Design a protein around this ligand. Structure first.
Ligand code: FAD
Ligand code: NAI
Ligand code: HEM
Ligand code: HEM
Length: 399
């Protein structure tokens, strides 16, 4: 659920609407519903830019995309009501037909985005990118309809023009510029290690130092023959300065490509570090819960803090010893640091991790990274045990 950490973002959205609502009501009340929709459209584009300000305001990329979806849905309902109030299925003049086309494209794209989950990610993104054409058609329709009412010196013209320009610039940046100018970290793969039957470790040497906190993730683009160049999100699993580590598990065609065919010497590019699950910013008493590949952020901490300063209880749940990674590393960390307690849960033979009887230390932050059902069950159990415990979790998907 949303908390105060996103309030700066939320007040940005609400003030975006109220200021819109009071503007149209002052000038053209008959257009409050469509005008608000226009705002709700531009915000949507702004929520797709992945800018650091958005992450700061909404505290997380997952919350950013939740608000993105909510604004998209609000826009589509407002536009459907506007269409029902002002016309039919097809207009008689070009200005109205532009709006007809824009609303049709918006509805089709929203339906495909919500109901298309097994579509390939790149094909999904290509279909999703038609929102820019729908938005341009909508702006054309608005400006032919209004004429010399958005082209004067008043609050309405400045509001509509500023929001439209912000949406246009955000869409152009995310669709055309972001993958070509916002990936300044140029690196080369130096070493590859297959940790088990379906996980591989990638070591990257960069031309510039990379700054990140343990528990954060980045977007990686690989440039090798037979590989897709699209950016994939991966947790930074280690490295300091010009060296980076990524631990990639086979989860599809691209990750299987990484496992079998990736080679040392291949060029890679990275944009920056994202994430709110910063372990070093938590309380002294800590509980770490990982499931499968969700161990990747915690490993970063272990790799970057040879001496532990916190009271850490780590629960690592895996399906059999063949699905476990970094077991020797965790055992060495436990042996070297007496303040690091390690609990390995072979869920194949032990069963699911249950926290109803397990005791959490007082005044503690819990970090969870695993399958979403596991996180939900453990969060319910821990909240039932102690409502004052801090709970932080990281999801491995945006939609
Ligand atoms: C914040 C974050 C951190 C992650 N950290 C790790 C990590 O440390 N190790 C690891 O192995 N995996 C990690 N992942 C997951 C990893 O990014 C996906 O498994 C990978 O992108 C899927 O590639 P694929 O083509 O093999 O999968 P596919 O078979 O194409 O799809 C599997 C699923 O992965 C997601 N996905 C696919 N392509 C993309 C894409 N380009 N961008 C975003 N999501 C996509 C979708 O939800 C899709 O349903 C992380 C994901 C996120 C969001
Ligand atoms: N942060 C996230 O959202 C993460 C998501 N994933 C994703 O989940 C998928 C599964 O891959 P893996 O993690 O390798 O395997 P996995 O999900 O099968 O293994 C994770 C561990 O959690 C346990 N588990 C699963 N559901 C549970 C529940 N309801 N209650 C208790 N324990 C439960 C499993 O028994 C296993 O030991 C992948 O696509 C991966 O990307 C995995 C880890 C982190
Ligand atoms: C209806 C108005 C919408 C607009 C204007 C819009 C716009 C965009 C744009 C321009 C992008 C970036 C495209 C790119 O990277 O090339 C994006 C990304 C994204 N959108 Fe939308 N979108 C809309 C609706 C939705 C809906 C309905 C959903 C989900 C149900 C959604 C979920 C996402 C997600 C998860 C991403 C991240 C893509 C990634 O991880 O690479 N959007 N959006
Ligand atoms: C934001 C301010 C907007 C204003 C002031 C506005 C104004 C108007 C007006 C006056 C009409 C009736 C004109 C006519 O039917 O001949 C109309 C119709 C329509 N508008 Fe808008 N509009 C706005 C936004 C939008 C947007 C963004 C879209 C689509 C994305 C849209 C889609 C439509 C549709 C589908 C019709 C029906 C046309 C018809 O059936 O003839 N409107 N609008």
């Amino acid at each position: 659920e949303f908390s105060m950490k996103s309030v700066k973002g939320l007040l940005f959205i609400i003030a975006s609407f109220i200021l819109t609502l009071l503007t149209w009501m002052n000038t053209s009340p008959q257009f409050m519903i469509p005008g608000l929709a226009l705002t709700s459209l531009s915000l949507t584009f702004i929520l797709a830019t992945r800018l650091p300000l958005l992450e700061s305001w909404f505290h997380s990329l997952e919350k950013v995309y939740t608000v993105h979806k909510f604004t998209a849905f609000l826009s589509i309902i407002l536009l459907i009501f506007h269409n029902f109030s002002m016309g039919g299925l097809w207009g008689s003049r070009l200005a109205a037909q532009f709006g007809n086309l824009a609303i049709y494209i918006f509805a089709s794209i929203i339906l495909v985005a919500y109901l298309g989950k097994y579509i390939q990610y790149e094909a999904w993104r290509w279909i999703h990118r038609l929102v820019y054409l729908a938005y341009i058609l909508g702006l054309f329709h608005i400006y032919m309809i209004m004429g010399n009412r958005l082209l004067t010196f008043n609050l309405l013209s400045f509001l509509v023009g500023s929001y439209a320009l912000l949406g246009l610039l955000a869409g152009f940046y995310i669709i055309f510029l972001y993958q070509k100018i916002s990936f300044p970290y140029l690196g080369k793969i130096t070493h590859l290690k297959r940790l088990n039957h379906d996980t591989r470790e990638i070591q990257i040497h960069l031309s510039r130092p990379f700054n990140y906190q343990s528990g954060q993730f980045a977007f990686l683009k690989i440039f090798q023959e037979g590989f897709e160049s699209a950016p994939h999100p991966f947790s930074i699993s280690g490295g300091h300065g010009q060296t980076l580590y990524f631990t990639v598990k086979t989860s599809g065609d691209h990750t299987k490509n990484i496992y079998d065919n990736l080679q040392a010497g291949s060029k890679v590019t990275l944009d920056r570090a994202y994430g709110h699950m910063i372990i070093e910013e938590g309380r002294e008493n800590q509980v770490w819960i990982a499931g499968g590949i969700g161990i990747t952020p915690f490993i970063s901490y272990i790799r970057e803090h040879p001496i532990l300063d916190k009271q850490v209880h780590f629960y690592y749940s895996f399906r059999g010893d063949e699905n476990a990674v970094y077991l020797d590393l965790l055992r060495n960390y436990a042996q070297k640091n007496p303040n690091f307690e390690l609990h390995l849960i072979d869920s194949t033979k032990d069963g699911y991790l249950n926290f109803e009887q397990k005791e959490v230390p007082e005044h503690a932050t819990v970090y969870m990274c695993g399958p979403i059902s596991m996180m939900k069950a453990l969060a319910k159990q821990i909240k039932k045990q102690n409502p004052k415990t801090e709970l932080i979790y990281e999801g491995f998907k945006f939609k």
